[PDB]
Structure formats: C-alpha cells, structure tokens
Amino acid sequence: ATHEVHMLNKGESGAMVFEPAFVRAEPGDVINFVPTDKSHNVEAIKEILPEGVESFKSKINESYTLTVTEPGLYGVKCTPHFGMGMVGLVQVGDAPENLDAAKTAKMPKKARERMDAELAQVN
Amino acid sequence: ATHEVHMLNKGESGAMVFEPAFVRAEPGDVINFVPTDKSHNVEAIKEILPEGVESFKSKINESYTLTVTEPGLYGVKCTPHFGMGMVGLVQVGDAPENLDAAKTAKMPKKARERMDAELAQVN
Amino acid sequence: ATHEVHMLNKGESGAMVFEPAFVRAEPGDVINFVPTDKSHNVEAIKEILPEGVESFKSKINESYTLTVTEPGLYGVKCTPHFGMGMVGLVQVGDAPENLDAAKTAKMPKKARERMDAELAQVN
Amino acid sequence: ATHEVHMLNKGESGAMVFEPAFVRAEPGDVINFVPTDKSHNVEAIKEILPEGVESFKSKINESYTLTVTEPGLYGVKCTPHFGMGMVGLVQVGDAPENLDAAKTAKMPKKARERMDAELAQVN
Ligand SMILES: [Cu+2]
Ligand SMILES: [Cu+2]
Ligand SMILES: [Cu+2]
Ligand SMILES: [Cu+2]
C-alpha cells in the first residue's frame, strides 16, 4: 500500500507540520512525502529508525518516495523546521521494537511535544 | 473561516476516526463534519463544551455544520463509535479555560486515549 | 460509494471552482460538497438534472450531502459565483440521457466554458 | 511555488489519470509527480514543450520533480499508459505561445480526448 504525507506551512495541527503526522504501514509499503508549500523537506531522525535502515534526506521542495522495508518506528523531520517542531512518525508493522528509543530520543522541545502526540497513536 | 472534519471507518489514525481529530478555530467559524463513510455522526461531549453552548447530536450519514461562537474547547464524539474511540477536539480561540475539564472528563478507555492525543495540540 | 467535491476560491483549475469538477458515480452514491474556503454553496442547475430529481440549494459555508438516486447528468453551480464560472458536473451511471440538455443549457459564458470542459469527461 | 500531481490507476476523472490533469504555474515553480499508485511515470510530450526545455522521462514508481523555468505549455504522458489517455498539461505563465502545437500534436485517440479537455483550462 502507498501512503501520502504533506509538508505544510500551516494546517489544522499548527505551523510547520507533517499531515498526517502519523502513518500506520506494513513492510513493503511506500510513503510519499509531498510538499503543499515551498520551503520543506524530509529527513530521517537517526535515533528513531529500525535496525539496518539507511538515513535519508530529501532536497527542498521535492516529493520523496520512501519504501519502508523494515518493521519498526521511523521518525522524520523537516531539516530547516526541526526546531519549530516539524516532525512525523511512521509505524511499520505491529509491536515496534524501538518504542523506547522514540520516547527518549533527544530533539528540540517543540519536536518532542509533537513526537509525543504522534506516539500516542502507536497500536 | 470554514474547517472540515471527515468521519471515517478507517484512516491513517486508525479505525473509527475523525480526521483531522483536532481543529483550531476562532469565534464565528464553522466546522463541517462530513460523512466520508457511512455509519457516523457527531455529538457534543457535554463535559467538554464552553459555557452557553447548546448540545448537539446529528443524524447518522448526514453532514453537520457546527458554528462556534463561544471560545473554549469543544469535544465531540460519534455516538455508535464512542467506545471505539471516535472522538475529536475543537479549540476555539487562544487560552481555553476548560483544558482541565477536557483532561478529566469520563469516557471509554479508547476515547480517553484519543482525547489525550488531541489535547496535546492545544496551543 | 461516497465522493467528495471541494468548493474553493483558487485551485489549479482557476478561480471560483469545484474540484474535482467532474464526478463519475452510480445510482445510490453519495456526493459531499464541502467548502475549502468561506463564501460558497452548491445549487442544482435545473436544466441539467435527471427526470424526477428535485432542485437543491445549500446554505453558504455548509457541507451538503447529495444522494444521487437517479441516473443521468447533474449540473451544479455555486449561487454567488455562477457568473464567475463556478460549476461542476456529476455523471450518474452509463449513457446519460440528458447529454444534449447539458451541452445546450443556457448559463453565463465562463460557466459554459467550464461545463464544456467537464462534459469532455463523460464516459 | 510548489505544485502536486498524483499518478493514479483510477480517480474521479477515469482510469490511468494524472490528477489534477492541468497545472497553472509560473517560471521557477516546481511540479511534483507523485506515485500515488504504482505502475506510472511521467514523460515529456516532445511536441508540447517550450523552446530550450530538455525532454524528460522518469522511472516507473518514482517521484519526479519538474522545474519549470521557461514559459509556455508542457504536455506530459505516462509512458505505459499513453494509449489509455494518461496525459497532463502544465501552463507556465500567461499567454502561452504553443497553444496551436498542443491542439494539433499527434497522440493516441484517448490521449487527444484528454488533452483537449485539459486545453480548455488554458487562461
Ligand atoms: Cu519544513
Ligand atoms: Cu462513527
Ligand atoms: Cu462559490
Ligand atoms: Cu500510468
């Protein structure tokens, strides 16, 4: 299955946001990170990634197509807006092993607040 | 301003969901609840509602337009799916006075889990 | 099946638009006409409606839920923006009997231009 | 500014479609072609392309970012689905000089039908 996440200046969820901020996927799924507005990208939060998953960083304003082969939690940020809390979360498969890592990973205050909100969706 | 909330059997956020689950509005705004899938309605959570706001309960499968005049937090539920956690939150204006009431309001376990996730967006 | 049409001030398709501007449905389907921005409504174009279908006119800024029980073409307009060409088209079922009526119905110039574009999608 | 086009097996506009099928842009904009479904790509229609614009052909299932520097009409096709009418149109800037070329360019019957529908949006 394929999923889409938008990068936005302003949504219902606030300023500098990924929407949806949480994606539930299965191994082999595709996630498309697509700008709604200019100025954004997507980059892996290294401390919120499954084992063996390479970091990634898209170019500003480009759609980025991520295949989530490995199960677990994938945290993402927008590079210039990380401090403004622009973060998202993808859960791939059941019972993610890196839940604790995601709860404790160091990041800017607003990013941690939004990541904590996203973590509430883990199922 | 207008806002839109979809009533869904399933979304990225799970089963039986309002998407978006959080809306940020100002007095005079309208929020449209849209029957994207059949089987849903929208009903006020009486304990999460500003003073002077009349309760409401729409008919299954219909659109409902909520005009928010009074500032504060408005909690909403889908009647048949309340236990399945189908709840949403509208913040109207800055500095909502009823944050505590929203934190403590009694509801089914999954509803409380989802309301806690939504409350994290209050700004 | 349920379908959604947005009412917008400005889309890729221009100013004062329904998007999608064409919906392909089957008898018994539901179409939700939902504002993206304030100022819009949806109203039937009386001369583009199947036999026996009652006219409808939504209130400004409200989501409107239309059940398309009868087969044929349904033309819609936004009341205040009809002259600005804000029109849409729903095809319900195969081989619509009112195709000629839709091609010849009198309306403002910009509405006719956009209706002609929509009619190209009839299948 | 950014723009987004989805590559779809099916949409309201039919089978094998770009949605939106028409994009209005300005020089310097980017257009992201998003693999919402698998099986698609984006390729320039050589006869509908401004002067000095290099041809392009993306890989199946990938995102593609088109930077539009030169003004005029850019026609695009999906390679495997060209005969199925999977074509799109980008207008860059006012008063495009190559409208006639877009009207007459040779292509499969269904592609010409869909391109004629798209050309109706040129402004
Ligand atoms: Cu950003
Ligand atoms: Cu429900
Ligand atoms: Cu209008
Ligand atoms: Cu294709």
Side-chain angles (χ1 to χ4, degrees):
Chain A
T2 299
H3 310 259
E4 176 158 342
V5 177
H6 281 286
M7 290 90 91
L8 298 91
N9 291 351
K10 297 289 301 147
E12 290 295 352
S13 65
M16 306 308 191
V17 288
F18 287 95
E19 294 184 336
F22 180 80
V23 169
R24 181 58 166 84
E26 293 296 332
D29 281 5
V30 171
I31 307 148
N32 294 135
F33 293 93
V34 186
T36 297
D37 308 300
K38 67 184 184 181
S39 81
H40 308 286
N41 77 325
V42 67
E43 183 179 6
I45 299 172
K46 280 179 174 74
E47 293 191 333
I48 315 178
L49 279 183
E51 298 299 312
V53 176
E54 296 289 319
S55 189
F56 52 89
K57 185 183 176 175
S58 70
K59 306 161 68 65
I60 298 286
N61 303 329
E62 298 198 341
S63 179
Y64 186 80
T65 295
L66 174 71
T67 298
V68 288
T69 303
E70 297 309 301
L73 297 169
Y74 296 63
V76 299
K77 60 188 166 173
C78 171
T79 308
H81 301 133
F82 191 29
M84 296 177 81
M86 194 161 173
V87 299
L89 183 66
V90 184
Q91 176 180 349
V92 186
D94 202 4
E97 283 150 43
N98 61 331
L99 181 65
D100 283 345
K103 290 189 184 293
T104 63
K106 291 284 173 174
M107 58 183 66
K109 185 171 90 70
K110 201 165 180 63
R112 173 40 66 193
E113 289 169 340
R114 288 164 168 198
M115 185 53 62
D116 283 350
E118 291 157 17
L119 284 165
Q121 301 298 334
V122 167
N123 65 194
Chain B
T2 61
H3 302 87
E4 181 182 13
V5 176
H6 296 193
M7 300 185 279
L8 298 168
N9 292 342
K10 211 272 160 187
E12 290 294 353
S13 63
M16 307 309 192
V17 289
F18 290 108
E19 289 192 348
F22 179 81
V23 169
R24 182 60 164 82
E26 297 292 340
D29 284 2
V30 293
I31 302 98
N32 286 120
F33 292 88
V34 181
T36 301
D37 293 321
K38 292 183 171 299
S39 82
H40 309 287
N41 76 329
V42 66
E43 177 179 17
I45 298 171
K46 283 196 193 74
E47 295 300 318
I48 312 173
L49 212 56
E51 297 301 299
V53 178
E54 286 306 303
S55 190
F56 52 90
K57 182 183 183 179
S58 69
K59 300 285 196 67
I60 300 282
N61 298 343
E62 301 297 337
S63 285
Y64 184 79
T65 304
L66 175 62
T67 297
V68 289
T69 300
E70 296 307 305
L73 297 175
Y74 296 62
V76 302
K77 59 183 161 178
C78 172
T79 309
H81 302 133
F82 192 27
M84 290 161 204
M86 193 161 174
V87 298
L89 185 67
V90 185
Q91 174 179 350
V92 183
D94 185 28
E97 65 177 39
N98 60 332
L99 184 61
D100 286 346
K103 288 173 170 175
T104 64
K106 288 170 183 69
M107 56 185 70
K109 196 90 178 292
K110 210 178 222 312
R112 171 43 62 195
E113 286 165 352
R114 281 151 170 215
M115 182 58 64
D116 284 348
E118 295 158 15
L119 284 165
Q121 301 299 152
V122 170
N123 64 12
Chain C
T2 299
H3 310 259
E4 176 158 342
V5 177
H6 281 286
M7 290 90 91
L8 298 91
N9 291 351
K10 297 289 301 147
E12 290 295 352
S13 65
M16 306 308 191
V17 288
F18 287 95
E19 294 184 336
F22 180 80
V23 169
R24 181 58 166 84
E26 293 296 332
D29 281 5
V30 171
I31 307 148
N32 294 135
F33 293 93
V34 186
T36 297
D37 308 300
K38 67 184 184 181
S39 81
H40 308 286
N41 77 325
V42 67
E43 183 179 6
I45 299 172
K46 280 179 174 74
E47 293 191 333
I48 315 178
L49 279 183
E51 298 299 312
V53 176
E54 296 289 319
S55 189
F56 52 89
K57 185 183 176 175
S58 70
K59 306 161 68 65
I60 298 286
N61 303 329
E62 298 198 341
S63 179
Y64 186 80
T65 295
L66 174 71
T67 298
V68 288
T69 303
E70 297 309 301
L73 297 169
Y74 296 63
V76 299
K77 60 188 166 173
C78 171
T79 308
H81 301 133
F82 191 29
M84 296 177 81
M86 194 161 173
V87 299
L89 183 66
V90 184
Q91 176 180 349
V92 186
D94 202 4
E97 283 150 43
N98 61 331
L99 181 65
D100 283 345
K103 290 189 184 293
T104 63
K106 291 284 173 174
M107 58 183 66
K109 185 171 90 70
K110 201 165 180 63
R112 173 40 66 193
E113 289 169 340
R114 288 164 168 198
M115 185 53 62
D116 283 350
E118 291 157 17
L119 284 165
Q121 301 298 334
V122 167
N123 65 194
Chain D
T2 61
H3 302 87
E4 181 182 13
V5 176
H6 296 193
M7 300 185 279
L8 298 168
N9 292 342
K10 211 272 160 187
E12 290 294 353
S13 63
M16 307 309 192
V17 289
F18 290 108
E19 289 192 348
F22 179 81
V23 169
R24 182 60 164 82
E26 297 292 340
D29 284 2
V30 293
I31 302 98
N32 286 120
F33 292 88
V34 181
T36 301
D37 293 321
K38 292 183 171 299
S39 82
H40 309 287
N41 76 329
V42 66
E43 177 179 17
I45 298 171
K46 283 196 193 74
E47 295 300 318
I48 312 173
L49 212 56
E51 297 301 299
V53 178
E54 286 306 303
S55 190
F56 52 90
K57 182 183 183 179
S58 69
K59 300 285 196 67
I60 300 282
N61 298 343
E62 301 297 337
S63 285
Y64 184 79
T65 304
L66 175 62
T67 297
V68 289
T69 300
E70 296 307 305
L73 297 175
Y74 296 62
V76 302
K77 59 183 161 178
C78 172
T79 309
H81 302 133
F82 192 27
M84 290 161 204
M86 193 161 174
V87 298
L89 185 67
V90 185
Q91 174 179 350
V92 183
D94 185 28
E97 65 177 39
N98 60 332
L99 184 61
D100 286 346
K103 288 173 170 175
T104 64
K106 288 170 183 69
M107 56 185 70
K109 196 90 178 292
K110 210 178 222 312
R112 171 43 62 195
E113 286 165 352
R114 281 151 170 215
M115 182 58 64
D116 284 348
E118 295 158 15
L119 284 165
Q121 301 299 152
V122 170
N123 64 12

